């Protein structure tokens, strides 16, 4: 229940590891084969970024989708009148670094509604609470949460 | 052929070699190399009217939802507008064990007292030395240190933690006895997979003295296999002779390098105990590697059969040349297979056909060379052209029939429904035919081309040849005539015993293990010694496997069962869905679907669990979600005018997802809509009460009664066509059924063609029926021996049944065609003459393949030793039976009653 500090990985080990994260497998396009694995969230209580207007965030991995919904409903309790903001769920234009998990869809960078500072630090530990795999304080601008995939 | 073969064999030899080399180059150039990725490459049947439905269902599950523009049947994603925009002391176990992680069970040595404390410490340390002492990516690494992330996941860790020590090996062993009593008292309790992250538990606690999240582990997942519920006595403390160890890592293709480099050469573990079960998930992976490597046993086979071919006829060069002829025939047959007919596959068994191929080859050359020597014996100072003509006239047709028999055998095996044997059949059949033609052309040439301290060895060769001669000259006739009833009675009794072991006693039975676990390696190999001897000794596995898995009823409407998959011999790849021409929207349509669910709510196989909300048919779900006013859609009839229907279906299901979305991952009752807004398929399911067996009969009763009912559709014109579609997970059922029916019908066609060619050769009904008796007795006793060795049917030992008949008639045909030199007695002299004439021929023609398969035996990949043993048995039996019997019965029958139509044919 602490405001997770700057640059703090909760699983205590780097992302590309079989502990809660595994490793990257393959790219995904709008027409790739494995793209079927992705689903839209469309939970109206959450506000999306959608700077690409193609739904780069509004869709994700169902395994990650359920966990994100869990975090949404759990932070609605501890913080009222908030609207969580996923800045980048799945990147295809490449706004992130290469071979990044965001390209896979097992990860999403999360911020609060009104762009608050200490709320990020607490929200990281909250993302831990909902049961997320590799929540890392990637940037001061966004909280980075990444999940393992099934199969 | 004979016209210009006279002293001009170089031309035909050269054109044959050119043919061979060009076909080899084409075969290695144009088609794509075979995969050998998975042995079970094509086991799933095709075109069997159920596998049709099954493959369509699977193809459908493939084209599932894609978040935006799924572009297939799945869902409603179009409406996205929505009118808006350890080394530690404790707490040391990161996760709980599961099937996902890799595992290894340990067996004790002669000490057999597994609760020995050095046994435990040795277990853990040898495990870590043999596994962890290698470059390892790691494990979950809950802490920062990636080394002692998950310590060995062993029971030693458990006893250490009950001792509450940061070090597993340090064990005074008193706590071992304490926890021994504890485990006894706990096995008394039946004691849950509690969370227990803290001491307090929501469920009732049988006893706090049971350490949280510890005893249930040893009792249910860990080394304990003997189920540890004896109620005998403290003195009766067993050893738990079987023990299991999970790997701190996880099972997957990656572990392949570790097992290969680090865990094969090791003869065993240690004198205290040793490995017996190595389940690392990586079985199909390294399979092909053992295949490649363990291929020198066929090399020993081919070289020893070449050697004995030399022994037979001293013309060593002829032996080498006919061997190369066999091999080249294999090659050109492969070329014809993959290329000429544009169909390609290679199901791992064609790399076993080669043995019986070279057997039949060497068979068909002996007869030719011996006929050549016979015709050279008389009138040797004659014309080479005439010699060729006469020896050909006397041997070629014999060769042709004695090969065309097995040719037709395999071209009959084609009729089955397994792909992984359709391909084998066609390939080996064209192979044997091309072998015959290449022999009948090539061999004459190379034969006629043979224009051409050692003394004592040559003398022993001469003497042993004369010994064989006299043995076949006096001994065998003496035996068969002097008994003339003993062998016949003995073989009647053996046929009886065979029919008995196949009929009522432990008999031929369908496969038992699950599809993906066909024992592919030698049963003594650890990987599969895991299965069939240990998997059924573990609480989690056993109590998980075959337990309360109610198979689901299921039905479709949107699609039609058309396997667009290269129907005739698919490549085990290639499928494509489609759409029907129905409309769910009609008022009578949804009314009928409702009434359908109603009727199905009255049946026997149903199981009214009464816990569902959204899993059964969604029409009643509408009904409940209806009467929702002021949105607007409410206050209507239970049927609808298709308009409220079309507007409300998407609206409502989207609102169900909006309330609390639950994943619908192409298994749910979720109706199917496409990229643009239209519902297309109406999948819905149920729950049966049959508990997912594996044996045939229960599944058959189930599927038969169920499809019997659902076939009665009697629906309205819309969605009334071929919509039956009832399909469970009964794939294994389909494999089994088609395997049985296929081996049956194939055996039938094989015996039919054998009897027909027996007619066409001997022209006597009587001796043909007698040969039929012969081959029937042979196949019966050999399959009886097989089942005595506990050999279920599979993709492999099915074709063996049918090929056995072809291999068997190969001797009866000779003993039948040999009814010449009609003596005064109707029986006496003719049979002894035939026997003395064909003795060495048949005996060597058998012993060759016998010794081939015999030296083949000790290997690792199952298929090899399987085929080796089968051929050894079938050849031994076919020879001995054929001779002894098919003369004994003939000794007591007069075959001078026949039917002749034209005397023109010769042989
Ligand atoms: C390499 C393979 C795949 C193709 C070629 C195989 C045969 C066509 C070759 C191999 C060995 C050759 C033989 C090697 C030696 C001789 C002996 C030679 O004898 C003489 O010239 C007779 C001399 C005399 O006695 O006066 C005649 C050619 C011949 C039969 C050769 C004919 C062609 C043969 C059979
Ligand atoms: C000795 C000859 C005259 C008769 C016996 C032939 C066999 C030894 C051949 C025939 C088919 C061959 C197989 C055909 C295809 C493959 C797949 C091929 O796959 C690869 O090359 C991928 C992996 C790698 O690069 O090693 C490896 C060899 C292998 C198993 C071959 C192993 C050797 C086999 C069994
Ligand atoms: C004509 C002489 C040379 C004897 C040939 C004997 C075999 C080599 C033949 C007999 C049956 C044949 C098969 C009969 C039918 C087919 C299906 C055919 O594919 C289709 O018909 C696909 C569906 C369609 O288009 O109708 C591909 C060849 C194949 C396997 C044939 C392969 C060659 C076979 C095994
Ligand atoms: C299904 C296919 C692949 C079978 C191919 C078999 C042919 C290679 C064989 C079968 C019948 C054979 C023929 C059977 C009988 C004769 C007659 C023979 O001459 C005589 O008998 C005439 C003198 C006399 O009467 O003694 C010369 C060989 C020849 C043409 C044989 C040549 C080789 C033939 C065509
Ligand atoms: C070499 C030939 C002459 C004999 C052996 C080949 C087949 C005739 C055998 C081998 C496997 C046997 C089958 C193995 C197991 C079963 C299941 C068994 O199931 C039942 O008893 C349920 C009721 C039913 O199947 O009708 C029925 C016999 C059957 C189909 C057997 C029928 C006879 C088969 C096909
Ligand atoms: C009296 C003379 C003329 C008999 C000549 C033939 C025998 C030497 C053959 C016939 C059947 C053979 C047996 C067939 C099968 C086997 C099983 C084989 O072991 C396995 O295949 C085990 C497989 C498994 O673990 O299931 C060991 C050899 C053995 C006993 C063979 C030993 C040699 C036998 C007795
Ligand atoms: C009269 C004999 C000496 C010669 C003529 C018969 C033999 C050539 C063959 C015919 C059938 C064979 C039998 C077929 C099957 C078996 C079962 C096989 O059983 C086992 O190895 C496993 C036994 C078990 O564990 O149940 C042992 C060899 C044996 C008796 C074989 C021994 C050799 C036999 C008698
Ligand atoms: C069962 C037991 O005594 N476990 C001991 C514990 O008492 C002690 O507090 C700890 C620190 O040394 O080491 C461990
Ligand atoms: C060979 O196996 C035995 C167990 O049967 C084992 O004691 C011995 O150590 C092994 N050989 C070597 C060199 O380790
Ligand atoms: C189903 O059967 C029960 C018992 O016979 C009966 O009460 C009920 O009305 C039936 N319902 C339908 C729809 O047939
Ligand atoms: C689907 O319907 C839309 C109209 O909304 C049309 O533009 C599109 O071409 C249709 N696509 C297919 C594959 O029928
Ligand atoms: Zn990120």
PDB file of C-alpha atoms in Angstrom, chain B residues 237-466:
ATOM      1  CA  UNK B 237       5.655 -48.653   6.824  1.00  0.00           C
ATOM      2  CA  UNK B 238       6.380 -48.985   3.087  1.00  0.00           C
ATOM      3  CA  UNK B 239       9.302 -47.429   1.223  1.00  0.00           C
ATOM      4  CA  UNK B 240       7.359 -45.451  -1.408  1.00  0.00           C
ATOM      5  CA  UNK B 241       9.552 -47.235  -3.913  1.00  0.00           C
ATOM      6  CA  UNK B 242       8.534 -44.737  -6.585  1.00  0.00           C
ATOM      7  CA  UNK B 243       9.483 -41.092  -6.099  1.00  0.00           C
ATOM      8  CA  UNK B 244       8.940 -38.043  -8.284  1.00  0.00           C
ATOM      9  CA  UNK B 245      10.835 -34.776  -8.573  1.00  0.00           C
ATOM     10  CA  UNK B 246       9.695 -31.618 -10.290  1.00  0.00           C
ATOM     11  CA  UNK B 247      12.216 -29.481 -12.075  1.00  0.00           C
ATOM     12  CA  UNK B 248      12.459 -25.904 -10.805  1.00  0.00           C
ATOM     13  CA  UNK B 249      12.214 -25.005 -14.498  1.00  0.00           C
ATOM     14  CA  UNK B 250       9.351 -25.513 -16.944  1.00  0.00           C
ATOM     15  CA  UNK B 251       8.832 -28.097 -19.654  1.00  0.00           C
ATOM     16  CA  UNK B 252       9.281 -27.075 -23.267  1.00  0.00           C
ATOM     17  CA  UNK B 253      11.365 -27.460 -26.385  1.00  0.00           C
ATOM     18  CA  UNK B 254      14.224 -25.550 -24.752  1.00  0.00           C
ATOM     19  CA  UNK B 255      15.114 -28.368 -22.362  1.00  0.00           C
ATOM     20  CA  UNK B 256      16.123 -30.401 -25.424  1.00  0.00           C
ATOM     21  CA  UNK B 257      19.722 -29.184 -25.349  1.00  0.00           C
ATOM     22  CA  UNK B 258      19.961 -29.961 -21.642  1.00  0.00           C
ATOM     23  CA  UNK B 259      18.705 -33.508 -21.951  1.00  0.00           C
ATOM     24  CA  UNK B 260      20.794 -34.249 -25.030  1.00  0.00           C
ATOM     25  CA  UNK B 261      24.117 -32.910 -23.782  1.00  0.00           C
ATOM     26  CA  UNK B 262      23.662 -33.598 -20.109  1.00  0.00           C
ATOM     27  CA  UNK B 263      21.409 -36.559 -19.412  1.00  0.00           C
ATOM     28  CA  UNK B 264      21.767 -39.356 -22.013  1.00  0.00           C
ATOM     29  CA  UNK B 265      25.289 -40.822 -21.758  1.00  0.00           C
ATOM     30  CA  UNK B 266      24.863 -41.212 -17.984  1.00  0.00           C
ATOM     31  CA  UNK B 267      24.408 -44.933 -17.470  1.00  0.00           C
ATOM     32  CA  UNK B 268      22.305 -44.263 -14.375  1.00  0.00           C
ATOM     33  CA  UNK B 269      22.214 -41.815 -11.476  1.00  0.00           C
ATOM     34  CA  UNK B 270      24.009 -43.525  -8.591  1.00  0.00           C
ATOM     35  CA  UNK B 271      24.148 -46.709  -6.558  1.00  0.00           C
ATOM     36  CA  UNK B 272      21.692 -45.301  -4.036  1.00  0.00           C
ATOM     37  CA  UNK B 273      18.961 -44.877  -6.663  1.00  0.00           C
ATOM     38  CA  UNK B 274      18.452 -44.128 -10.324  1.00  0.00           C
ATOM     39  CA  UNK B 275      16.200 -42.347 -12.770  1.00  0.00           C
ATOM     40  CA  UNK B 276      13.331 -44.247 -14.311  1.00  0.00           C
ATOM     41  CA  UNK B 277      10.968 -41.615 -15.681  1.00  0.00           C
ATOM     42  CA  UNK B 278      12.134 -38.635 -17.692  1.00  0.00           C
ATOM     43  CA  UNK B 279       9.132 -36.507 -18.636  1.00  0.00           C
ATOM     44  CA  UNK B 280      10.486 -33.282 -20.102  1.00  0.00           C
ATOM     45  CA  UNK B 281       7.741 -32.586 -22.631  1.00  0.00           C
ATOM     46  CA  UNK B 282      10.393 -32.880 -25.305  1.00  0.00           C
ATOM     47  CA  UNK B 283       9.573 -36.229 -26.813  1.00  0.00           C
ATOM     48  CA  UNK B 284       8.514 -35.458 -30.376  1.00  0.00           C
ATOM     49  CA  UNK B 285      11.391 -32.982 -30.560  1.00  0.00           C
ATOM     50  CA  UNK B 286      14.462 -35.166 -30.248  1.00  0.00           C
ATOM     51  CA  UNK B 287      12.543 -38.061 -31.819  1.00  0.00           C
ATOM     52  CA  UNK B 288      13.790 -37.345 -35.318  1.00  0.00           C
ATOM     53  CA  UNK B 289      17.323 -37.084 -33.961  1.00  0.00           C
ATOM     54  CA  UNK B 290      17.250 -40.616 -32.562  1.00  0.00           C
ATOM     55  CA  UNK B 291      15.648 -41.656 -35.843  1.00  0.00           C
ATOM     56  CA  UNK B 292      18.514 -40.262 -37.911  1.00  0.00           C
ATOM     57  CA  UNK B 293      21.190 -41.588 -35.575  1.00  0.00           C
ATOM     58  CA  UNK B 294      19.682 -44.980 -34.946  1.00  0.00           C
ATOM     59  CA  UNK B 295      19.692 -45.941 -38.593  1.00  0.00           C
ATOM     60  CA  UNK B 296      22.876 -48.033 -38.649  1.00  0.00           C
ATOM     61  CA  UNK B 297      20.842 -51.064 -37.669  1.00  0.00           C
ATOM     62  CA  UNK B 298      19.206 -51.073 -41.113  1.00  0.00           C
ATOM     63  CA  UNK B 299      22.767 -50.707 -42.399  1.00  0.00           C
ATOM     64  CA  UNK B 300      23.868 -53.832 -40.540  1.00  0.00           C
ATOM     65  CA  UNK B 301      20.737 -55.451 -41.957  1.00  0.00           C
ATOM     66  CA  UNK B 302      21.412 -54.560 -45.585  1.00  0.00           C
ATOM     67  CA  UNK B 303      25.060 -55.554 -45.343  1.00  0.00           C
ATOM     68  CA  UNK B 304      24.354 -58.917 -43.731  1.00  0.00           C
ATOM     69  CA  UNK B 305      21.627 -59.687 -46.250  1.00  0.00           C
ATOM     70  CA  UNK B 306      24.048 -58.777 -49.033  1.00  0.00           C
ATOM     71  CA  UNK B 307      26.564 -61.159 -47.470  1.00  0.00           C
ATOM     72  CA  UNK B 308      24.116 -64.046 -47.338  1.00  0.00           C
ATOM     73  CA  UNK B 309      23.006 -63.281 -50.890  1.00  0.00           C
ATOM     74  CA  UNK B 310      26.666 -63.765 -51.773  1.00  0.00           C
ATOM     75  CA  UNK B 311      26.643 -67.041 -49.827  1.00  0.00           C
ATOM     76  CA  UNK B 312      23.699 -68.238 -51.905  1.00  0.00           C
ATOM     77  CA  UNK B 313      25.175 -67.578 -55.353  1.00  0.00           C
ATOM     78  CA  UNK B 314      28.947 -67.118 -55.402  1.00  0.00           C
ATOM     79  CA  UNK B 315      28.517 -64.416 -58.082  1.00  0.00           C
ATOM     80  CA  UNK B 316      29.412 -61.614 -55.679  1.00  0.00           C
ATOM     81  CA  UNK B 317      29.176 -58.966 -58.383  1.00  0.00           C
ATOM     82  CA  UNK B 318      25.645 -60.063 -59.265  1.00  0.00           C
ATOM     83  CA  UNK B 319      24.700 -59.714 -55.602  1.00  0.00           C
ATOM     84  CA  UNK B 320      26.067 -56.183 -55.361  1.00  0.00           C
ATOM     85  CA  UNK B 321      24.384 -55.227 -58.613  1.00  0.00           C
ATOM     86  CA  UNK B 322      20.963 -56.511 -57.590  1.00  0.00           C
ATOM     87  CA  UNK B 323      21.327 -54.776 -54.220  1.00  0.00           C
ATOM     88  CA  UNK B 324      21.992 -51.510 -56.026  1.00  0.00           C
ATOM     89  CA  UNK B 325      18.993 -52.370 -58.195  1.00  0.00           C
ATOM     90  CA  UNK B 326      16.807 -52.585 -55.091  1.00  0.00           C
ATOM     91  CA  UNK B 327      18.084 -49.264 -53.768  1.00  0.00           C
ATOM     92  CA  UNK B 328      17.649 -47.518 -57.111  1.00  0.00           C
ATOM     93  CA  UNK B 329      14.110 -48.874 -57.229  1.00  0.00           C
ATOM     94  CA  UNK B 330      13.456 -47.287 -53.847  1.00  0.00           C
ATOM     95  CA  UNK B 331      14.760 -44.015 -55.255  1.00  0.00           C
ATOM     96  CA  UNK B 332      12.762 -43.988 -58.484  1.00  0.00           C
ATOM     97  CA  UNK B 333       9.661 -45.022 -56.557  1.00  0.00           C
ATOM     98  CA  UNK B 334      10.152 -42.041 -54.256  1.00  0.00           C
ATOM     99  CA  UNK B 335      10.427 -39.874 -57.363  1.00  0.00           C
ATOM    100  CA  UNK B 336       7.195 -41.274 -58.791  1.00  0.00           C
ATOM    101  CA  UNK B 337       5.534 -40.796 -55.410  1.00  0.00           C
ATOM    102  CA  UNK B 338       6.304 -37.169 -54.613  1.00  0.00           C
ATOM    103  CA  UNK B 339       6.425 -35.865 -58.195  1.00  0.00           C
ATOM    104  CA  UNK B 340       4.518 -37.862 -60.807  1.00  0.00           C
ATOM    105  CA  UNK B 341       1.170 -37.727 -59.009  1.00  0.00           C
ATOM    106  CA  UNK B 342       1.530 -34.215 -57.559  1.00  0.00           C
ATOM    107  CA  UNK B 343       0.575 -35.492 -54.104  1.00  0.00           C
ATOM    108  CA  UNK B 344       3.141 -35.285 -51.340  1.00  0.00           C
ATOM    109  CA  UNK B 345       3.492 -36.545 -47.771  1.00  0.00           C
ATOM    110  CA  UNK B 346       5.924 -38.740 -46.010  1.00  0.00           C
ATOM    111  CA  UNK B 347       4.572 -40.306 -42.835  1.00  0.00           C
ATOM    112  CA  UNK B 348       7.673 -41.767 -41.230  1.00  0.00           C
ATOM    113  CA  UNK B 349       6.707 -45.341 -42.129  1.00  0.00           C
ATOM    114  CA  UNK B 350       8.158 -45.349 -45.625  1.00  0.00           C
ATOM    115  CA  UNK B 351      11.417 -45.326 -43.666  1.00  0.00           C
ATOM    116  CA  UNK B 352      10.375 -48.740 -42.423  1.00  0.00           C
ATOM    117  CA  UNK B 353       8.963 -50.144 -45.666  1.00  0.00           C
ATOM    118  CA  UNK B 354      12.480 -50.369 -47.105  1.00  0.00           C
ATOM    119  CA  UNK B 355      13.246 -53.472 -45.060  1.00  0.00           C
ATOM    120  CA  UNK B 356      10.418 -55.621 -46.375  1.00  0.00           C
ATOM    121  CA  UNK B 357      11.096 -54.024 -49.755  1.00  0.00           C
ATOM    122  CA  UNK B 358      14.659 -55.290 -49.922  1.00  0.00           C
ATOM    123  CA  UNK B 359      13.440 -58.595 -48.519  1.00  0.00           C
ATOM    124  CA  UNK B 360      10.971 -59.085 -51.361  1.00  0.00           C
ATOM    125  CA  UNK B 361      13.631 -57.882 -53.774  1.00  0.00           C
ATOM    126  CA  UNK B 362      16.284 -60.378 -52.730  1.00  0.00           C
ATOM    127  CA  UNK B 363      13.509 -62.960 -52.819  1.00  0.00           C
ATOM    128  CA  UNK B 364      12.692 -62.228 -56.438  1.00  0.00           C
ATOM    129  CA  UNK B 365      16.317 -62.411 -57.584  1.00  0.00           C
ATOM    130  CA  UNK B 366      17.118 -65.817 -56.105  1.00  0.00           C
ATOM    131  CA  UNK B 367      14.430 -67.494 -58.192  1.00  0.00           C
ATOM    132  CA  UNK B 368      15.825 -65.848 -61.311  1.00  0.00           C
ATOM    133  CA  UNK B 369      19.469 -66.755 -60.784  1.00  0.00           C
ATOM    134  CA  UNK B 370      18.529 -70.315 -59.842  1.00  0.00           C
ATOM    135  CA  UNK B 371      16.311 -70.704 -62.905  1.00  0.00           C
ATOM    136  CA  UNK B 372      19.240 -69.394 -64.931  1.00  0.00           C
ATOM    137  CA  UNK B 373      21.564 -71.986 -63.424  1.00  0.00           C
ATOM    138  CA  UNK B 374      18.978 -74.705 -64.033  1.00  0.00           C
ATOM    139  CA  UNK B 375      18.547 -73.852 -67.710  1.00  0.00           C
ATOM    140  CA  UNK B 376      22.312 -73.476 -68.070  1.00  0.00           C
ATOM    141  CA  UNK B 377      22.747 -76.956 -66.599  1.00  0.00           C
ATOM    142  CA  UNK B 378      20.989 -78.623 -69.511  1.00  0.00           C
ATOM    143  CA  UNK B 379      22.181 -77.811 -73.062  1.00  0.00           C
ATOM    144  CA  UNK B 380      24.810 -75.260 -71.970  1.00  0.00           C
ATOM    145  CA  UNK B 381      26.386 -75.104 -75.447  1.00  0.00           C
ATOM    146  CA  UNK B 382      23.353 -73.295 -76.845  1.00  0.00           C
ATOM    147  CA  UNK B 383      22.614 -69.740 -77.953  1.00  0.00           C
ATOM    148  CA  UNK B 384      22.820 -67.004 -75.330  1.00  0.00           C
ATOM    149  CA  UNK B 385      19.757 -65.338 -76.837  1.00  0.00           C
ATOM    150  CA  UNK B 386      17.858 -68.622 -76.614  1.00  0.00           C
ATOM    151  CA  UNK B 387      19.096 -69.134 -73.058  1.00  0.00           C
ATOM    152  CA  UNK B 388      17.766 -65.703 -72.113  1.00  0.00           C
ATOM    153  CA  UNK B 389      14.462 -66.395 -73.841  1.00  0.00           C
ATOM    154  CA  UNK B 390      13.922 -69.704 -72.073  1.00  0.00           C
ATOM    155  CA  UNK B 391      15.004 -68.606 -68.596  1.00  0.00           C
ATOM    156  CA  UNK B 392      12.811 -65.527 -68.936  1.00  0.00           C
ATOM    157  CA  UNK B 393       9.844 -67.595 -70.095  1.00  0.00           C
ATOM    158  CA  UNK B 394      10.358 -69.812 -67.065  1.00  0.00           C
ATOM    159  CA  UNK B 395      10.954 -67.193 -64.361  1.00  0.00           C
ATOM    160  CA  UNK B 396       9.516 -63.794 -65.315  1.00  0.00           C
ATOM    161  CA  UNK B 397       5.845 -64.613 -64.805  1.00  0.00           C
ATOM    162  CA  UNK B 398       6.602 -66.352 -61.519  1.00  0.00           C
ATOM    163  CA  UNK B 399       8.393 -63.193 -60.408  1.00  0.00           C
ATOM    164  CA  UNK B 400       5.511 -61.054 -61.609  1.00  0.00           C
ATOM    165  CA  UNK B 401       2.853 -62.890 -59.649  1.00  0.00           C
ATOM    166  CA  UNK B 402       4.937 -63.406 -56.517  1.00  0.00           C
ATOM    167  CA  UNK B 403       5.408 -59.635 -56.388  1.00  0.00           C
ATOM    168  CA  UNK B 404       2.055 -58.437 -57.747  1.00  0.00           C
ATOM    169  CA  UNK B 405       0.511 -60.260 -54.804  1.00  0.00           C
ATOM    170  CA  UNK B 406       2.006 -57.823 -52.272  1.00  0.00           C
ATOM    171  CA  UNK B 407       1.561 -55.022 -54.789  1.00  0.00           C
ATOM    172  CA  UNK B 408      -2.188 -55.594 -54.725  1.00  0.00           C
ATOM    173  CA  UNK B 409      -1.956 -56.005 -50.952  1.00  0.00           C
ATOM    174  CA  UNK B 410      -0.701 -52.451 -50.558  1.00  0.00           C
ATOM    175  CA  UNK B 411      -2.930 -50.998 -53.266  1.00  0.00           C
ATOM    176  CA  UNK B 412      -5.717 -52.516 -51.189  1.00  0.00           C
ATOM    177  CA  UNK B 413      -4.396 -51.041 -47.948  1.00  0.00           C
ATOM    178  CA  UNK B 414      -4.966 -47.775 -49.797  1.00  0.00           C
ATOM    179  CA  UNK B 415      -8.696 -48.232 -49.191  1.00  0.00           C
ATOM    180  CA  UNK B 416      -8.497 -47.324 -45.502  1.00  0.00           C
ATOM    181  CA  UNK B 417      -9.309 -43.884 -44.139  1.00  0.00           C
ATOM    182  CA  UNK B 418      -6.070 -43.043 -42.332  1.00  0.00           C
ATOM    183  CA  UNK B 419      -3.812 -40.774 -44.357  1.00  0.00           C
ATOM    184  CA  UNK B 420      -0.689 -41.981 -42.552  1.00  0.00           C
ATOM    185  CA  UNK B 421      -1.339 -45.366 -44.137  1.00  0.00           C
ATOM    186  CA  UNK B 422      -2.897 -44.319 -47.448  1.00  0.00           C
ATOM    187  CA  UNK B 423       0.457 -42.742 -48.250  1.00  0.00           C
ATOM    188  CA  UNK B 424       2.462 -45.731 -47.008  1.00  0.00           C
ATOM    189  CA  UNK B 425       0.332 -48.052 -49.099  1.00  0.00           C
ATOM    190  CA  UNK B 426       0.618 -46.148 -52.355  1.00  0.00           C
ATOM    191  CA  UNK B 427       4.336 -45.533 -51.941  1.00  0.00           C
ATOM    192  CA  UNK B 428       5.330 -49.088 -51.106  1.00  0.00           C
ATOM    193  CA  UNK B 429       3.028 -50.492 -53.781  1.00  0.00           C
ATOM    194  CA  UNK B 430       4.507 -48.481 -56.615  1.00  0.00           C
ATOM    195  CA  UNK B 431       7.865 -49.320 -55.056  1.00  0.00           C
ATOM    196  CA  UNK B 432       7.359 -53.062 -55.315  1.00  0.00           C
ATOM    197  CA  UNK B 433       5.971 -52.836 -58.843  1.00  0.00           C
ATOM    198  CA  UNK B 434       8.887 -50.741 -60.057  1.00  0.00           C
ATOM    199  CA  UNK B 435      11.170 -53.186 -58.273  1.00  0.00           C
ATOM    200  CA  UNK B 436       9.646 -56.028 -60.267  1.00  0.00           C
ATOM    201  CA  UNK B 437       9.985 -54.299 -63.623  1.00  0.00           C
ATOM    202  CA  UNK B 438      13.500 -53.071 -62.914  1.00  0.00           C
ATOM    203  CA  UNK B 439      14.469 -56.604 -61.927  1.00  0.00           C
ATOM    204  CA  UNK B 440      12.957 -58.273 -64.986  1.00  0.00           C
ATOM    205  CA  UNK B 441      14.827 -55.884 -67.254  1.00  0.00           C
ATOM    206  CA  UNK B 442      18.088 -55.092 -65.440  1.00  0.00           C
ATOM    207  CA  UNK B 443      18.886 -58.495 -63.935  1.00  0.00           C
ATOM    208  CA  UNK B 444      18.866 -60.428 -67.253  1.00  0.00           C
ATOM    209  CA  UNK B 445      21.432 -57.996 -68.628  1.00  0.00           C
ATOM    210  CA  UNK B 446      23.818 -58.108 -65.685  1.00  0.00           C
ATOM    211  CA  UNK B 447      23.402 -61.883 -65.484  1.00  0.00           C
ATOM    212  CA  UNK B 448      24.345 -62.519 -69.106  1.00  0.00           C
ATOM    213  CA  UNK B 449      27.150 -60.006 -68.686  1.00  0.00           C
ATOM    214  CA  UNK B 450      28.645 -62.391 -66.120  1.00  0.00           C
ATOM    215  CA  UNK B 451      30.884 -64.013 -68.715  1.00  0.00           C
ATOM    216  CA  UNK B 452      33.336 -65.365 -66.106  1.00  0.00           C
ATOM    217  CA  UNK B 453      44.523 -71.092 -48.935  1.00  0.00           C
ATOM    218  CA  UNK B 454      41.230 -70.380 -50.693  1.00  0.00           C
ATOM    219  CA  UNK B 455      41.038 -74.047 -51.731  1.00  0.00           C
ATOM    220  CA  UNK B 456      40.049 -75.414 -48.314  1.00  0.00           C
ATOM    221  CA  UNK B 457      37.394 -72.723 -47.905  1.00  0.00           C
ATOM    222  CA  UNK B 458      36.061 -73.473 -51.393  1.00  0.00           C
ATOM    223  CA  UNK B 459      35.955 -77.136 -50.366  1.00  0.00           C
ATOM    224  CA  UNK B 460      33.931 -76.381 -47.248  1.00  0.00           C
ATOM    225  CA  UNK B 461      31.556 -74.317 -49.397  1.00  0.00           C
ATOM    226  CA  UNK B 462      31.132 -77.261 -51.771  1.00  0.00           C
ATOM    227  CA  UNK B 463      30.581 -79.724 -48.927  1.00  0.00           C
ATOM    228  CA  UNK B 464      28.065 -77.517 -47.130  1.00  0.00           C
ATOM    229  CA  UNK B 465      26.187 -76.906 -50.380  1.00  0.00           C
ATOM    230  CA  UNK B 466      25.956 -80.660 -50.911  1.00  0.00           C
TER     231      UNK B 466
END
